[PDB]
Amino acid sequence: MALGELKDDDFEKISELGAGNGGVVFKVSHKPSGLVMARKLIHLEIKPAIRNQIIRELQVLHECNSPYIVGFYGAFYSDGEISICMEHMDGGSLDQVLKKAGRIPEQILGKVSIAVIKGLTYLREKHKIMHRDVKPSNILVNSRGEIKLCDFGVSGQLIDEMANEFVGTRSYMSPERLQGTHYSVQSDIWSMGLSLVEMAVGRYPRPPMAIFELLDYIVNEPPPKLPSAVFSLEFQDFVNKCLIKNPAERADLKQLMVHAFIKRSDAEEVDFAGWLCSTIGL
């Protein structure tokens, strides 16, 4: 195989890229091959049987080949930590982008939407993987203006081991999934919807309120909306279609791929690489 034997000593740290909900991310050098990578270290306390079942499940990522999906190099265990090794995105994520930008403009978000719709389609049609955690920190970008999905639930055991340590981004869960309902394809679309609204307006799109209240609000109250004067009705409509509370009525990826917002967006000439670089100092 291309790399075959990944181990801690090969890798040399260039920078920490930061920490999330159970992992820390480094920009590495892979000394032997000359590859620049992102290496996510997820600390767990697990049997060596389950630690090897996770690593074997992860190897399915070798098969994920898409310009809309962050590329995988390998997965290994060393000194208390599972390593996921992946293509390095020099734009970081949209959540980082949003913190620097304040608000991400609708035209860039039409381009975000397309890549996401296409990433999710690929994962589902090729590999039968739902993402399970769509949110701006898991949408990555680079100086070539590429936009890619990371952190999707490839390994059912890493899912399992992840869940029964941490609660996660319950703020991103669909009403149905908060009511207990098992994960659905229709849940990734809800979260795509909410992600776009949040990047559009510059902040998590619900009234502020203690966490437990939020969860009941989501199931009980109606879904978020864009403000109607400062966004196109195309973008408005697109967003509302992803955020129907009934999963039977929510739009699917197919229907979303042909929406007027997307048709419009695709034909636009947006220099997102240029924007990103003036924006974040690349």
Ligand SMILES: Nc1ncnc2c1ncn2[C@@H]1O[C@H](COP(=O)(O)OP(=O)(O)CP(=O)(O)O)[C@@H](O)[C@H]1O
């Ligand atoms: N392939 C990659 N290239 C560059 N930066 C990356 C990267 N993957 C992750 N990062 C950055 O590292 C940081 C940590 O990622 P991580 O997935 O740990 O947390 P997060 O910020 O997405 C919350 P969560 O843990 O729920 O996903 C994030 O800022 C992310 O943007």
Ligand SMILES: NCC1(O)CN(C(=O)c2ccc(F)c(F)c2Nc2ccc(I)cc2F)C1
């Ligand atoms: N906060 C919860 C999360 O958002 C779920 N996270 C993961 O890192 C993750 C979880 C399950 C899984 F199978 C992975 F492969 C995961 N990682 C993963 C999946 C695909 C790629 I490419 C790169 C990756 F690191 C963080």
Ligand SMILES: [Mg+2]
């Ligand atoms: Mg993440």
